[PDB]
Design a protein around this ligand. Sequence first.
Ligand SMILES: CNC(=O)[C@@H]1CCCN1S(=O)(=O)c1ccc(Cl)c(COc2cccc3c(-n4ccnc4)cc(C(F)(F)F)nc23)c1Cl
Length: 221
Amino acid sequence: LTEIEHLVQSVCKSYRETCQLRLEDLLRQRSNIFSREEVTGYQRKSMWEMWERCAHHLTEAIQYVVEFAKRLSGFMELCQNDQIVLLKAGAMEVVLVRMCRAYNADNRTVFFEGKYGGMELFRALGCSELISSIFDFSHSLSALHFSEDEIALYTALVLINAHRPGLQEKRKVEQLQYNLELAFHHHLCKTHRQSILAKLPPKGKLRSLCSQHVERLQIFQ
Ligand SMILES: CNC(=O)[C@@H]1CCCN1S(=O)(=O)c1ccc(Cl)c(COc2cccc3c(-n4ccnc4)cc(C(F)(F)F)nc23)c1Cl
């Protein structure tokens, strides 16, 4: 009881403290859309330049997720090895989930460098299939109309995953995961939102999208 509802409020607080982007700013900026000439500007950048600027933005978003982990009940009590394994496996997946907040399903645009643009803005990356899959993924997640509280609890579980290969204190991650699931399940049951569980994307889907070009990021500043 009591303890579960306390865990729920602690995870929702850690999340709100560690957002890269205030929801109210993303929503207010939805009318601020890149011009054709601004899009053409992005489409003529070199593949290298466009990967450099996307790598920089991904790194910045990852730092806010590392701060989420630091503030998450139980995380900083796991062994250093397991903290590193969970972040390395989970941090980019949490960025991908956080990005459905910055996605406008009404015109299929995403917040990027101060305005909203469609997937054709990212043409110079030369990975149009991946961009289209990230847009498709965000479209599907946007459709759950997550509360900030639901996003907090869901992203806590994306991170605290006792099946990540290379964990050394597997039983201690399982104990923290189990408490987070009881927290998530209790919140959804109480709000009558338990139908969203069957709509959450498979873990293999988050993996493949978030890791398809990991080796490449190393060569960007
Ligand atoms: C919304 N505001 C922001 O500042 C966002 C939050 C997250 C990143 N920034 S953003 O710059 O504006 C930004 C906003 C929208 C878009 Cl669609 C991109 C582009 O996305 C990606 C492009 C290329 C590769 C991506 C990739 N990846 C890396 C290695 N293998 C896969 C993973 C991811 C993902 F994070 F997992 F989704 N996105 C990727 C960026 Cl960068």
